[PDB]
Every structure is written in structure tokens, then in C-alpha cells.
């Protein structure tokens, strides 16, 4: 009942499909999420991975995929919604 976007930059080495759609597998109770991971080289965006992610309170009830981490090496977000990893943005924690 939950579907995400798939991406693997190491598509050739791992002999996996580069990009596409992924049907998730969870449980009757288990909430499912979509993850997205990328790089930011002072503006330029380099993709890393995208796909299914398991029940995590860090992703609970978050409609949008937003990286809350400030100035990290590998930017990451997760969200709870069908294809919500379609796009991502960065916005640090207010604090």
C-alpha cells in the first residue's frame, strides 16, 4: 500500500536498476516511509540513494522530505507518504 522512488548511484557496481519506482514491504501495523540522500557541493546537487524506509519516529507525520541537518556531508531526509521522496529540500533546525 506504500510506494516510493528508487535511486542507486552505484547502479552498475551493484548491478541494480539506476532509477525507478519501488513497492515497499511492511506490516499490518508498520508505518512505511520514503528516504532520500544526496550531496551538496556549494550549490551543485549530487544524488546518492532513494527508496523505502522503515517505521521511524524521525519520519512520523512529515508530509515533505526536508533535510533538518545543518551543513552535513551527506544530506538526508525521510517522509511518510506515497512518493513523498519525489523531491527534497534543505532547511536546518531553527534552534
Amino acid at each position: 500500500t506504500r510506494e516510493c522512488i528508487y535511486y542507486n548511484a552505484n547502479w552498475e557496481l551493484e548491478r541494480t536498476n539506476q532509477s525507478g519506482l519501488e513497492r515497499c514491504e511492511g506490516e499490518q501495523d508498520k508505518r512505511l516511509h520514503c528516504y532520500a540522500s544526496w550531496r551538496n557541493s556549494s550549490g551543485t546537487i549530487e544524488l546518492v540513494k532513494k527508496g523505502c524506509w522503515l517505521d521511524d519516529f524521525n519520519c512520523y507525520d512529515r508530509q515533505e522530505c526536508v533535510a533538518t541537518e545543518e551543513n552535513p556531508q551527506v544530506y538526508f531526509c525521510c517522509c511518510e507518504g506515497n512518493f513523498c521522496n519525489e523531491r527534497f529540500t534543505h532547511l536546518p533546525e531553527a534552534g
Epitope: 532509477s19 546537487i45 506515497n82 523531491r87 527534497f88 529540500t89
Partner: antibody, heavy 119, light 115 residues
Framework: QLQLQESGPGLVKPSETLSLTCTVS??????????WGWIRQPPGKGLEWIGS???????YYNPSLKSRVTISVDTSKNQFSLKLSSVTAADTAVYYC???????????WGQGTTVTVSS | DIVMTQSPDSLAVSLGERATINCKSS????????????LAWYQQKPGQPPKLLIY???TRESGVPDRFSGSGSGTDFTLTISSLQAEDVAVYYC??????????FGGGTKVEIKR
């Protein structure tokens, strides 16, 4: 704030080929979306989906125009182009580029370019 | 190729009164996601591109007033303007963003004011 801008000739000779390009500000083509599409609207007529593409180059076209339509993707300059061969007077229309999203619809649109096919 | 059909072609309604436009699809656009109703409604004024009004056939996009309400399910849907206002004079379209992709648009319904 996502902004889309089309670029290309407003005039095209008949039987030739039409080329337009959508440039993206606010976000990249890899982030900010998956599919990016092209739409066209003839004068005083309804909207017609041309095609759409992804940041990998996964191309999907309208059945009526699969013959001549060609979408490109340039991850470097935040662009995606449209090329339509063997133009006719029926291809005189306003062309728009839009963010084709799975959830939601056509989120953001460009202001469109009026392309006239004439000698 | 999920064919879309809109009705009527034009509307003339006095300001304050309600407006109603219908959109019928040649295949039910529901999906096992339960979000179902993969339909969108857009408002286009003369010089401008279409402005997204409603997605999921029910939910609104930010900034769109309460006077606009989407409805329906399966194959039949409706867009309803509870109280037509002067700034609402436009041509409204419906579109299916169903996964299987002949991405089809409706005909368009021009709303007008009786003044």
C-alpha cells in the same frame, strides 16, 4: 521559490523542426521534482500534454505525437529541452513547461512562449 | 488513454451565487494508496498559464480561498464555487495525473458573470 522559464524561437518555418528549452531557478532538476513536462495550447483551444522526462532520462510521450516529439535533459545547466520535427500549421500554439508531479498535479508552470508556424 | 469530458461549456452566474462544473473520466482514477482520486483542477485567465487550484480531487493548494471546493470520486467529479466573485472569471480545466500515462486534460468550462 521555484521558477520556470521557456526559451526558443517564436517563429518556425513549415516542415522544419521546433526547439524550445526550459531553464529552472529556485531548485535543481534532480531535487525539486522527478518528472518535468511540456504542455501546449493552440489559440482558443484546450491544453495538450506533450511529454515528460525524469532526472535519469526516463522518457514518456503522448500517443498522438510519439512520432516527432523528443525531450532532452541536462543535469548541468538545470534544463530540459523539447524538439518536434516536421512542423505543420496545427503546431502553432503557446508552449509551457511545468513540474509534472506524482502527488499533486502540474505544480509550477512557465509563462509560455507563443510559437507561430509560418513562411 | 483515460478520456476526460467537462460540462457545461459556459456559465453565466450572478455574483454571490454558486457555480458548478462537472468532469467525467472514461476510467475510474482510484488507486489502492487510499489517496485515490488522482484528479486536479486548474484556473486559467487569458494571458496567464493555468494556476493549480485543487489536487486529490478534494484538497486545495495554498492561497486558494474556501469558496472553491472539489468533490466526487471514481469516474465523476465536480468543482464548486460556493459564492462566485468577480475575480473568479476564468476557464477551468480538469486533469488526470494517473500513473499509467496518456496524461489527459478536460475540455474547459468558461465561467462568466451576470451583472
Amino acid at each position: 521559490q521555484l521558477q520556470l522559464q521557456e526559451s526558443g524561437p517564436g517563429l518556425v518555418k513549415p516542415s522544419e523542426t521546433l526547439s524550445l528549452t526550459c531553464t529552472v531557478s529556485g531548485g535543481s532538476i534532480s531535487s525539486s521534482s522527478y518528472y518535468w513536462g511540456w504542455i501546449r495550447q493552440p489559440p482558443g483551444k484546450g491544453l495538450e500534454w506533450i511529454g515528460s522526462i525524469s532526472y535519469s532520462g526516463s522518457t514518456y510521450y503522448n500517443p498522438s505525437l510519439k512520432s516527432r516529439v523528443t525531450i532532452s535533459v541536462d543535469t548541468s545547466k538545470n534544463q530540459f529541452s523539447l524538439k518536434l520535427s516536421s512542423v505543420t500549421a496545427a503546431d502553432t500554439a503557446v508552449y509551457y513547461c511545468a513540474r509534472d508531479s506524482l502527488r499533486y498535479g502540474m505544480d509550477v508552470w512557465g509563462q509560455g512562449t507563443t510559437v507561430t508556424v509560418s513562411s | 488513454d483515460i478520456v476526460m469530458t467537462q460540462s457545461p461549456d459556459s456559465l453565466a452566474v450572478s455574483l454571490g451565487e454558486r457555480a458548478t462544473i462537472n468532469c467525467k473520466s472514461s476510467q475510474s482514477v482510484l488507486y489502492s494508496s487510499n489517496n485515490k482520486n488522482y484528479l486536479a483542477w486548474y484556473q486559467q485567465k487569458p494571458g496567464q498559464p493555468p494556476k493549480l487550484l485543487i489536487y486529490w480531487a478534494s484538497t486545495r493548494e495554498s492561497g486558494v480561498p474556501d469558496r472553491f471546493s472539489g468533490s466526487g470520486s471514481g469516474t465523476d467529479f465536480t468543482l464548486t464555487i460556493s459564492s462566485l466573485q468577480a475575480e473568479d472569471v476564468a476557464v477551468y480545466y480538469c486533469q488526470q495525473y494517473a500513473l499509467a500515462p496518456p496524461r489527459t486534460f478536460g475540455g474547459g468550462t468558461k465561467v462568466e458573470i451576470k451583472r
